[PDB]
Amino acid sequence: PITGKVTAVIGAIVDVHFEQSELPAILNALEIKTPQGKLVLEVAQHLGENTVRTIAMDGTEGLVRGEKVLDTGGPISVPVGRETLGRIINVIGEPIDERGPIKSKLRKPIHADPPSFAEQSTSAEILETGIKVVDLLAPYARGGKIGLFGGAGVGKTVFIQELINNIAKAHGGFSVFTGVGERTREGNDLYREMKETGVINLEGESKVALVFGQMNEPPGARARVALTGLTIAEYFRDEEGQDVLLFIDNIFRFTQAGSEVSALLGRIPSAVGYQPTLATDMGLLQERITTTKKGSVTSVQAVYVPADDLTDPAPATTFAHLDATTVLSRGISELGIYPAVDPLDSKSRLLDAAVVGQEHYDVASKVQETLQTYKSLQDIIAILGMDELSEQDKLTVERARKIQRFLSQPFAVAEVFTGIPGKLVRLKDTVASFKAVLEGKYDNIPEHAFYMVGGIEDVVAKAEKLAA
Amino acid sequence: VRYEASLRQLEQRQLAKSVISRVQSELGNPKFQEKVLQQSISEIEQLLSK
Amino acid sequence: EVSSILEERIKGVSDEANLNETGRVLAVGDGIARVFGLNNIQAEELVEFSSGVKGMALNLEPGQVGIVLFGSDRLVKEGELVKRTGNIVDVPVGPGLLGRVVDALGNPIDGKGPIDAAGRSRAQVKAPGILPRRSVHEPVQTGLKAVDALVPIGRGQRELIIGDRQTGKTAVALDTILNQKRWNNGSDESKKLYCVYVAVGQKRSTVAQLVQTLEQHDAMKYSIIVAATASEAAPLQYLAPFTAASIGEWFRDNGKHALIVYDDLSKQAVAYRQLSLLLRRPPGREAYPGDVFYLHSRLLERAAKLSEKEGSGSLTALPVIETQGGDVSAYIPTNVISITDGQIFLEAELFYKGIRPAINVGLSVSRVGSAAQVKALKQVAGSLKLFLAQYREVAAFAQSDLDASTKQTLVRGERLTQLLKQNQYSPLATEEQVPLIYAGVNGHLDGIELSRIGEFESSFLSYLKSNHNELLTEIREKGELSKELLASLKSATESFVAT
Amino acid sequence: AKSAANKLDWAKVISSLRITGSTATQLSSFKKRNDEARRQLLELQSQPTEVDFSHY
Amino acid sequence: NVIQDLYLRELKDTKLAPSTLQDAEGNVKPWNPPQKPNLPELELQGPEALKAYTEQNVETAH
C-alpha cells in the first residue's frame, strides 16, 4: 500500500515521504488519519526521492511529524446525483449542512480533462430566460458566460434567485451556486431565503445546489470548491441531456486563492503580485463550461475588480471568456425599477443580425439609441430649462420614459415585496413588445401603468386601472 | 436518434471494463508465467542483434 | 460498429520495439520536468515519456536534463521511463494540412481525417540571410476601406494590427482571408495565399465557431487553423506560433504567396512568461522576461518577401495585439511595433460609435509598405492620407479661427470617415472599391450629405456597371488608371451626384 | 381577398375625414384586421407536416 | 502482444448487442399520439350577438 510518514509542515504545505515502489501521481488525494477529522492533501508537485509537496483543504495546525498518510490513487471523489441537489457541501464531498449523510450513488473525480473540440460549441444557442430586459439587450447563450456587475446586496442576490425559476420552466434544468470565499453569516441568510422561495426544499428534490468554501479554511479549499460544483453540472448535461445554469460568486477570490498556493509552493508571483498560473487555470475552467452534444453548462459569474482597476491582468483574462455583461446599477433602482440592469451598459458579443435574427438586433438597437439620445438630451435640458423642447425632441423623451418604467418586471422570488405575481415572457414575445412601442400603440398608454408589468397583452389591464 | 448516439457511447465504456476484467484474469493465471518465458526469448533475439 | 473501431485500433498498434537510451525521471512538475540520465541526447531533441506525453529538451546539464512538458502535469508521474525519440522537435509540412484542423503538435483534434505530409521540418529554424530578400510590389487586398490603399499593406509585409482585445479584432483578419478567394483560385500562383490563422490563448469554443464559420463562407479549403487554446497549457502556447510558421515557410519556399495571422502575440508573451518564471528566471520590465523580444524578432523575420532566386515567394504577416487600454508605454506592444513596419491602430471608442471597421488613421502609418499598391490604387487614394491628418488638427481647435476653408475641410473629412465603412464578413471587391475612393478624393462628397452616404454607394455602383462596364474591365486587367479613364469616371460620378 | 380589406380600410378613412359616422367603421376595420393578421402569422407558421424517415 | 491474444478471446466470448425496447422507452420521450382537440374556432354563435349589435350601435350624427 502506498503509505508514508509526514516529514514536514511548512505553512499549509505538508510533505509526506513514501517508501520504494510506492509512488503518487500529481493531483492525487492523501488522507491523513487523525481523530480530529481527516485532512485532504492534494499532490501539487513531485520533489522526487519518493517525497511530495501538497496543498491542504483544512488547517494544518497541530500536525505531528510521523502520522500515517494513505494515497487513494487519484483526486478527491465528490458525490453527484439528484441526492446532492439542495445540499451544502465543502470541497471534500461531505455535508457541512448537517442533514445526515448524502446518499452516494456515483462519485466522480474533481479534476477532469476539457471536452473534445467537436464537442465545444460550434454555434451560439440562445439560453431562454423569462426576464425580457436580459434577452433583448444582452442575449444569454448556452455556451457564453455573462459577468454580473453592480454592488452586492443591491438586488444581485435576488436577481440570482430569479434566474433559477425561469430555467425550471424553460428546460427542466437545475443549478449549482458556488461560493468561493463565502462570507459565513451571509450563507445562512441565502440558504434560508433559497429554501423559502422554494428553489431548494427539505420536501424532496431541489434545483440549486450550494457549494461553500469558508474563508477560514486554507487557500487551497477556496480554489477547489470551484472545480467541485462544476462536476455536479457536467453529469446532468452529458448523462441526462438537461440544461444547467451554474452561478459562480466573486472571481476576484479565485485569482487571490491561487497566488497564495503559488507563493507557498515556491513559485514566484507575477504581474500585480498575482499567481504565475493565472491564465492556464482559468482557461481549463472555462473550457469545461460549454454546450455539449447532449446538454449544456452555462455559467453566469460575478465580476468584482481590484479596487476599480481594469488594466490589471486578472479581469483581462476573465473578460476574454465572457461574451456578455449585465451591468446592475444603483441609479436605476432609485426609480423603483428592478430589474436593475442598466440598458446602455448591457452589451453582448452575440447580439447581432446573424445570431439573434435581424429583426431582433434592430429592435434591440433602436430601443438602445432612444435611451442614449434621451440621456444626452436631459443633460442640457437641466441647465437651460425644460421649456426648450420642440415637438420632435419630446418624441424621443416620451418613448424613452415609457420604456424606462416598462423595464420593471415583477419578480417571482420577490413576489411579497411587489405584491404582484412574477411573470415570465419568452424570447419571441420580447421582440414583439418593443416593436409595438416602436409603432406607437403604446405611446399614449399611461406612464404609471408601465410599472411592474410582463408581456405586450398584460399592460392593457393596468392602463384601464390607472384611468378608472 | 439521440439515445442511439448515447448507446454508442455506452457501448464503448462497457467494452472497456471487460478488457480490464481480462487483464486481471491473465495476471491471475499462470499465463503470467507462460508468457514471461515468451518475453524472455524475444528479448534474447533482439538484444543479440544490437 | 463499436466492436469494429476497437478491433481496428488494437491491430493498428503492437507497441513492441527495442530502444537506445532511457532515463528515469528525477522529480517532475511545474510544466518543467527534471530527468535523470539521458547522456547522449542532442539539444532540443523530442523525448517521449511513459505517460505518452512528449517534451523538448531545454537545459542539457552534466548529470541531468531538464525537458519542458507539452501537456498537463497530472499525466506525468515520478519514476516513469523517458525514451529518446532520436529526432529534433519537428512538425509535419506539406499540402495535406489544408482544411485539417490541428494543434501545435500537429495532431488532428477533431480533424478532418488523419494528417498527411510531404516532409517534416523543425519547429525552430532561423530565417534566410539579408541577401535573399526583396521589397514588396503586390498589394494585399482586405476588401475593407481604410487599409485598401488609405493605410497600405503588400505581399511580404509584416504590418501590424493593434487595438483593444475583442472589439471585433478577429473580423478584420478574416476579411483578409475571405476577400482573397477569386485571386486565390486563379491561374496566377503568386496571387494565391494559403493562410494559417494561429489561435493562441483563445477559448476552444470560439475556435470551433470560427471553423464552422469559415466552412459556410467556403474558405476553409485554403486555410489551416492551428490551436493552443486557453485550456491547453502554457509551453504548448509558447511553441504555437513557431510550429505554425514552419508550415507557412513551406508554402513560401515553393515560391507561392502565403499569409499567417498571429493572434495574439501578447498571449505568446504570457505563455512564455509563465514557463520562464517557474524555471527561476527573474522578471524584466512590466513583469514579462527580457528575452520576450528574442521570440518575436526571430519569429517575425521568417515572414518576409524573398527575391527572384527563391521563386519570389512570400509569407505576409498581420500580428494581432492585446493592448492594455490604448497604452504604448507597455513593453510587449512596443517590442512588436519596433521589429515591424506599419501599424493598423484600431479604436474601441470608434467601434462603439458606429465605425466598422474602426480603423483610426491618425496613428496608422506605412513605411516600406507603401510600394504595395499598383497604379490605380495610388491614383484614386491620392493624398487622402494627408487630408485626414489635416482634418485632425482642424477638429482640435473646433472645441481659434473659423473660416470656410477650415469648415469645408471638416465637412469633407466627416463625410469621408463615413464613406470608409463597409459591411463585415462580406468584404467589398477591390475593383468595386476603386470608384468609391475616387469620388471622395475628388471632393464629390459636397453634394452627398452624411445620412445618405450608404444609399448613394450601392446605387452608384449599380449605375456604373449597367452604363459602362468598360471602365471596370480595364481596372480588373490593367490595374493602372490612365488620364482618359480617370476623366470618364469623374464625368460619370458628377452625373450621379446631381440625380 | 386580403387586398380587398385594405382598400376598404383606406376608403372608409377618407370617408371619416368628412362625415361623422365612419369614425367607428374604422374601429371594425381594425377588429377584422386584428384576427386577419392572426390568419397571416398562422399561415406563415404552417410548413409541410411529414416526419422524416429517409435518414433518421 | 498479450493484448492481441486477450482482445480476440474477449471479443468472441463477450459480444454486446443493442439494449432492449423497455429500456429504451424509460430513457426516451414515449412518442406522441394524433394531435386533434376536435372542434374548430367558434366565434359569434347564434343570432344573439346580431340583435345585440344592430340595436346597440348607431353613431351617424355629429
Swiss-Prot record, chain A:
The gene is ATP2. The modification Phosphothreonine is found at T72, T197. Mitochondrial membrane ATP synthase (F(1)F(0) ATP synthase or Complex V) produces ATP from ADP in the presence of a proton gradient across the membrane which is generated by electron transport complexes of the respiratory chain. F-type ATPases consist of two structural domains, F(1) - containing the extramembraneous catalytic core, and F(0) - containing the membrane proton channel, linked together by a central stalk and a peripheral stalk. During catalysis, ATP synthesis in the catalytic domain of F(1) is coupled via a rotary mechanism of the central stalk subunits to proton translocation. One of its GO terms (molecular function) is proton-transporting ATPase activity, rotational mechanism. This is ATP synthase subunit beta, mitochondrial. Pfam families: ATP-synt_ab, ATP-synt_ab_N, ATP-synt_VA_C. ATP binds at G150, G151, A152, G153, V154, G155, K156, T157. Its EC number is 7.1.2.2. It is found in: Mitochondrion; Mitochondrion inner membrane. It catalyses: ATP + H2O + 4 H(+)(in) = ADP + phosphate + 5 H(+)(out). Its main location: mitochondrion. SMART domains: AAA (SM00382). Keywords: ATP synthesis, ATP-binding, CF(1), Hydrogen ion transport, Ion transport, Membrane, Mitochondrion, Mitochondrion inner membrane, Nucleotide-binding, Phosphoprotein, Transit peptide, Translocase, Transport. GO terms for biological process: proton motive force-driven ATP synthesis; proton motive force-driven mitochondrial ATP synthesis. It comes from the Eukaryota.
Curated annotation (Swiss-Prot), chain C:
The record marks S364 as: Required for activity. Mitochondrial membrane ATP synthase (F(1)F(0) ATP synthase or Complex V) produces ATP from ADP in the presence of a proton gradient across the membrane which is generated by electron transport complexes of the respiratory chain. F-type ATPases consist of two structural domains, F(1) - containing the extramembraneous catalytic core, and F(0) - containing the membrane proton channel, linked together by a central stalk and a peripheral stalk. During catalysis, ATP synthesis in the catalytic domain of F(1) is coupled via a rotary mechanism of the central stalk subunits to proton translocation. Keywords: ATP synthesis, ATP-binding, CF(1), Hydrogen ion transport, Ion transport, Membrane, Mitochondrion, Mitochondrion inner membrane, Nucleotide-binding, Phosphoprotein, Transit peptide, Transport. Present with 41500 molecules/cell in log phase SD medium. F-type ATPases have 2 components, CF(1) - the catalytic core - and CF(0) - the membrane proton channel. CF(1) has five subunits: alpha(3), beta(3), gamma(1), delta(1), epsilon(1). CF(0) has three main subunits: a, b and c. GO terms for biological process: proton motive force-driven ATP synthesis. HAMAP family: ATP_synth_alpha_bact (MF_01346). This is ATP synthase subunit alpha, mitochondrial.
Swiss-Prot record, chain D:
GO terms for biological process: proton motive force-driven ATP synthesis. GO terms for cellular component: mitochondrial inner membrane; mitochondrion; proton-transporting ATP synthase complex. Keywords: Acetylation, ATP synthesis, CF(0), Hydrogen ion transport, Ion transport, Membrane, Mitochondrion, Mitochondrion inner membrane, Transport. One of its GO terms (molecular function) is proton transmembrane transporter activity. It comes from the Eukaryota. The keyword Membrane applies. It is found in: Mitochondrion; Mitochondrion inner membrane. Signal peptide: none annotated. Present with 6820 molecules/cell in log phase SD medium. Belongs to the ATPase d subunit family. Mitochondrial membrane ATP synthase (F(1)F(0) ATP synthase or Complex V) produces ATP from ADP in the presence of a proton gradient across the membrane which is generated by electron transport complexes of the respiratory chain. F-type ATPases consist of two structural domains, F(1) - containing the extramembraneous catalytic core, and F(0) - containing the membrane proton channel, linked together by a central stalk and a peripheral stalk. During catalysis, ATP synthesis in the catalytic domain of F(1) is coupled via a rotary mechanism of the central stalk subunits to proton translocation. This is ATP synthase subunit d, mitochondrial. The chain holds residues 4 to 59 of 174 of the full protein.
Curated annotation (Swiss-Prot), chain E:
The keyword Ion transport applies. Keywords: ATP synthesis, CF(0), Hydrogen ion transport, Ion transport, Membrane, Mitochondrion, Mitochondrion inner membrane, Transit peptide, Transport. One of its GO terms (cellular component) is proton-transporting ATP synthase complex. Its main location: mitochondrion. It is found in: Mitochondrion; Mitochondrion inner membrane. GO terms for biological process: cristae formation; mitochondrial proton-transporting ATP synthase complex assembly; proton motive force-driven ATP synthesis; proton transmembrane transport. It comes from the Eukaryota. Present with 6140 molecules/cell in log phase SD medium. Mitochondrial membrane ATP synthase (F(1)F(0) ATP synthase or Complex V) produces ATP from ADP in the presence of a proton gradient across the membrane which is generated by electron transport complexes of the respiratory chain. F-type ATPases consist of two structural domains, F(1) - containing the extramembraneous catalytic core and F(0) - containing the membrane proton channel, linked together by a central stalk and a peripheral stalk. During catalysis, ATP synthesis in the catalytic domain of F(1) is coupled via a rotary mechanism of the central stalk subunits to proton translocation. Belongs to the ATPase h subunit family. This is ATP synthase subunit H, mitochondrial. The chain holds residues 33 to 94 of 124 of the full protein.
